């Protein structure tokens, strides 16, 4: 009956509302994905319940245990019926779950503390004073791990061996490390969120260079789910109507602090 939506607490997609403690259910959260979830449900005609993924991860398969974690995992093991989050459409994930066409287009990028002498990935690879890393269990980390491109492979070879760890558990943790490391730490994260942070006080971070790749986020459902077809048509319908662009402007730029 009520569709269980797995999502992640990640600003500006899903965030705890100001006085959420005084509210119930879906009304406790606000964000791009909360707005989208409400629309996807309206158009597909289903009641739903927003839920925050238990392990706070996007989703990766543990080689060896072979168990999927994050939102991907909740879909795979049947804990949730659908995932509405900034979840990247990738091959290893599409092999175990279904994705609608993209609702947002983006790519990996470099976030620096303003003033950092770095202008590209090539710059990062060619040096060592400035450490750099990615978010722990997801598509960005897999991108470098699986890359055959010289620059990206050089970066992986360093990152995978760097001590202490250059990987962070969450985006907030990477942004903080960037802000606190006095230009000695750069962060590899998707452009959508790099751009978001660039507009939030203290306005001390910046996105540099072009995107490392081009890809998208999709609404995910368990393989062979009944919701798949309709959510995909809903996504296409809503993008064509301009809602998705309207929502990015709302959560990114209208609410800009810089």
Residue list for the binding site: 86, 88, 93, 139-140, 190
DSSP letters, the chain, are: --EEEEE--BTTTBEE-TTGGG--GGGGEESHHHHHHHHHHHHHT--EEEEE-TT-----B-TTT--B-HHHHHHHTTS-SEE-SS-B--HHHHTTEEE-S-SEEE-EEEEEETT-S--SHHHHHT-SSSEEEEBSSSHHHHHHHH--SHHHHHHHHHHHH-SS---BSSHHHHHHHHHHTTTSEEEEEEHHHHHHHTTSTT--EEEES--S--EEE--EEETT-SSHHHHHHHHHHHHHTTHHHHHHIIIIIIT---
Q: Give the shortest CB-39-to-Zn ion separation in angstroms.
A: 5
Separation of alpha carbons 152 and 85, rounded Å: 26
Neighbours of 106 (CB within 10 A): 20
Q: Give the shortest CB-244-to-a copy of itself separation in angstroms.
A: 8
Whichever of 137 and 205 has its CB closer to a copy of itself, that residue is 137
Whichever of 117 and 242 has its CB closer to a copy of itself, that residue is 242
Of residues 7 through 26, those in contact with ligand AMQ by CB under 6 A are 10
Question: Which does residue 190 touch among ligand AMQ, a copy of itself, Zn ion, none (CB within 5 to 8 A, set by kind)?
Answer: ligand AMQ
In the structure encoding, which two tokens stand for residue 251, read together? 């959560």
Whichever of 46 and 139 has its CB closer to ligand AMQ, that residue is 139
- Which residue of the chain is nearest ligand AMQ when measured via CB? 138
Q: Which of 193, 197, 212, 235 binds ligand AMQ (CB under 6 A)?
A: 193
Pick the stretch among 28-36, 74-82, 185-193, 240-248 that binds ligand AMQ (CB under 6 A): 185-193
Whichever of 43 and 162 has its CB closer to ligand AMQ, that residue is 162
Contact between 64 and Zn ion per CB under 5 A: yes
Question: Which does residue 254 touch among a copy of itself, ligand AMQ, Zn ion, none (CB within 5 to 8 A, set by kind)?
Answer: none
Question: Which does residue 62 touch among Zn ion, a copy of itself, ligand AMQ, none (CB within 5 to 8 A, set by kind)?
Answer: Zn ion
Question: Where do contacts with a copy of itself occur on this chain (CB under 8 A)?
Answer: 89-91, 94-95, 99, 101-102, 105, 143, 146-149, 213-216, 218, 232-233, 236-237, 239-242, 244-245
Neighbours of 35 (CB within 10 A): 16
Whichever of 141 and 177 has its CB closer to a copy of itself, that residue is 141
Contact between 87 and ligand AMQ per CB under 6 A: yes
Whichever of 61 and 177 has its CB closer to a copy of itself, that residue is 61
Q: Give the shortest CB-17-to-ligand AMQ separation in angstroms.
A: 20
Contacts of 173 (CB under 8 A, 6+ apart): none
Pairing of strands 82-83, 3-7: parallel
Return residues touching ligand AMQ (CB under 6 A).
Answer: 10, 58, 86-88, 135, 138-140, 171, 189-190, 193
């Amino acid at each position: 009956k009520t569709v269980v939506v797995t999502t992640i607490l990640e600003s500006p997609y899903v965030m705890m509302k100001k006085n959420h403690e005084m509210l119930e259910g879906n009304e406790r959260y606000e964000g791009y994905c909360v707005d989208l979830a409400a629309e996807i449900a309206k158009h597909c005609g289903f009641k739903y319940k927003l839920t925050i993924v238990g392990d706070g991860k996007y989703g990766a398969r543990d080689a060896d245990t072979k168990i999927w974690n994050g939102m991907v995992g909740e879909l795979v093991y049947g804990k949730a019926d659908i995932a509405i989050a900034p979840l990247t459409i990738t091959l290893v994930r599409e092999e175990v779950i279904d994705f609608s066409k993209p609702f947002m287009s983006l790519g990996i990028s470099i976030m620096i503390k303003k003033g950092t002498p770095i202008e590209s990935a090539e710059d990062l690879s060619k040096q060592t004073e400035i450490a750099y890393g990615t978010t722990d269990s997801g598509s960005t980390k897999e991108f470098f791990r699986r890359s055959k491109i010289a620059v990206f492979d050089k970066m992986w070879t360093y990152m995978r061996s760097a001590e202490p760890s250059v990987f962070v558990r969450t985006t907030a943790e990477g942004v903080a490390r960037v802000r606190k490391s006095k230009g000695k730490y750069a962060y590899l994260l998707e452009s959508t969120m790099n751009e978001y942070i660039e507009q939030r006080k203290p306005c001390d971070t910046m996105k540099v260079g072009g995107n490392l790749d081009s890809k998208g986020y999709g609404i995910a459902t368990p393989k062979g789910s009944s919701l798949g077809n309709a959510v995909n048509l809903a996504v296409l319908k809503l993008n064509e109507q301009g809602l998705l662009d309207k929502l990015k402007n709302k959560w990114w730029y209208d609410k800009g602090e810089c």
